[PDB]
Design a protein around this ligand. Sequence first.
Ligand code: HEM
Ligand SMILES: NC(=O)c1cc(Cl)ccc1N
Length: 394
Amino acid sequence: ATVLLEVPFSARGDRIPDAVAELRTREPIRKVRTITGAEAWLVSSYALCTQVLEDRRFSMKETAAAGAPRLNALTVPPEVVNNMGNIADAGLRKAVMKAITPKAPGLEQFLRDTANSLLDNLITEGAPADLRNDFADPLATALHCKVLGIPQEDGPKLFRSLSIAFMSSADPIPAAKINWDRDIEYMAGILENPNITTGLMGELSRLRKDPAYSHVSDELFATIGVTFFGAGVISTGSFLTTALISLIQRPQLRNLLHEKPELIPAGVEELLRINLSFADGLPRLATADIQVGDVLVRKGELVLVLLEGANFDPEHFPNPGSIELDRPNPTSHLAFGRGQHFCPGSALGRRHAQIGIEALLKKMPGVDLAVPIDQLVWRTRFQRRIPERLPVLW
Ligand code: HEM
Ligand SMILES: NC(=O)c1cc(Cl)ccc1N
C-alpha cells in the first residue's frame, strides 16, 4: 500500500522529474498531499493550468481562510495574501506599477554598472566564485533598493530576512514574524524619512500625504515596501541563478548569445519558460464546484497550478525541454502566472536577467561550473528552488 502522492516532488531546480510528464499525460489533474498533510489537486497541463489561473472563482485570497486546506503555513498576516486587492482598493495600483518598470531613467545603466562591478570583483578575487551569493543576489538586492528608493547599504539586512520569509513550511515560523515586524518598522521609518524621495517608497510617501489617500493605512504603505522588496529580490535572484546554470550547461547556446547579444531577450524568455525556480504549484481555493478536466473540484478544496507542468507541456511547447529562440508562442509561458495575479514585476524581472546574463557573458565568456552539477546543494522546504552556492570558474 502507498500514501497519497506527496508534493513537492524534488527541490532540484536543474532538472524536471520524469514524474511530471507521466502525471500530465495520465492525470493532468490529480489529488496529492502537501507538507501540512492537507489534500490538494495538482494541475500539470497547460490547458488546465490556464483554466485555473483564469477563473477567479479559484481564489488566491481564500487560501488564507482559517481552516482551509493549506499548501504551507502563512509567513505573513492573513490580510497580506490579498496584497494586490488591498493595493487596488486603496487606489495605489497604477502608482505602484509605474514605479516598478525597468523603464525608469538610468535604472538600466544602474543594473549594468552594478553587474559589471560585482563581476570585476569576482574576477579580481580569482576562481572559484559563487554566482548566487556574490553575483545574482547582490544584483537583485541592489536593483530593488534602487527601485524602492532605499539606501543600497540597507539591502543586505533586508535580504537576510528572505531565507525565512519564503520558506514553504508545514508550520508557522516564529522567525518570519520577527523579521516581518522588523522590516515593517523599517519601511514605516522610510515613509517618515525626509531623504527618501525616489523610487517606490519616495512615491508612496508623497501619496501618503496626499488628501486623496488620507484613509489608506500606514500598515499598507509599509507592507507594500516589505512585500515588493521581498517578492522581487527572491524571484529575480532565484530566477537569474538557475537561469545561469541552464546557460552554463549549454555552451552552444552561450556561444550564440555571446556572438549575437541581441538574442539575449529571446534567450531569457526561453530561460523563464524552462525555469524551475518556483518550488510549489500556485495555490488557489475553489469558491465553487468547478469542473477541471475529469475532476469536479469542490468548493473549499485547494488547487495547486504546477507552472513547469504548463511550461513543459509538449502539446503547447514542442520539444519542451529544449531552448529554442524562434518559437512562435515564446512569451505564452506561465513563468509569471496568468490572469488576475499575473506578476506585476515581470518587465523588471526580464531586464534584471537580460542585463545580468549580458554582463556575465562579456566578462566571463569561459564561465563554467567549477563543481560537478550534482554537487549543487538545493534548498529544501522553500518557495523557490535554488542552489545554496553556485561555484563557477572562467
Ligand atoms: C523573474 C522574476 C520573477 C518571476 C519568475 C516571478 C513569478 C511570479 C508569478 C508566477 C506570480 C503569480 C503568483 C500567483 O498567481 O499566485 C507572481 C506574482 C507577484 N510578483 Fe512576481 N515574479 C518575478 C519578479 C517579481 C518582481 C521584479 C516583483 C516586484 C518587485 C514581483 C512581485 C510580485 C507580487 C507583489 C505578486 C503578487 C501578484 C498578485 O497577487 O496579484 N515578482 N510573481
Ligand atoms: N521580510 C519578511 O520577513 C517577510 C517578507 C515577505 Cl515578502 C513575506 C514574509 C516575510 N516574513
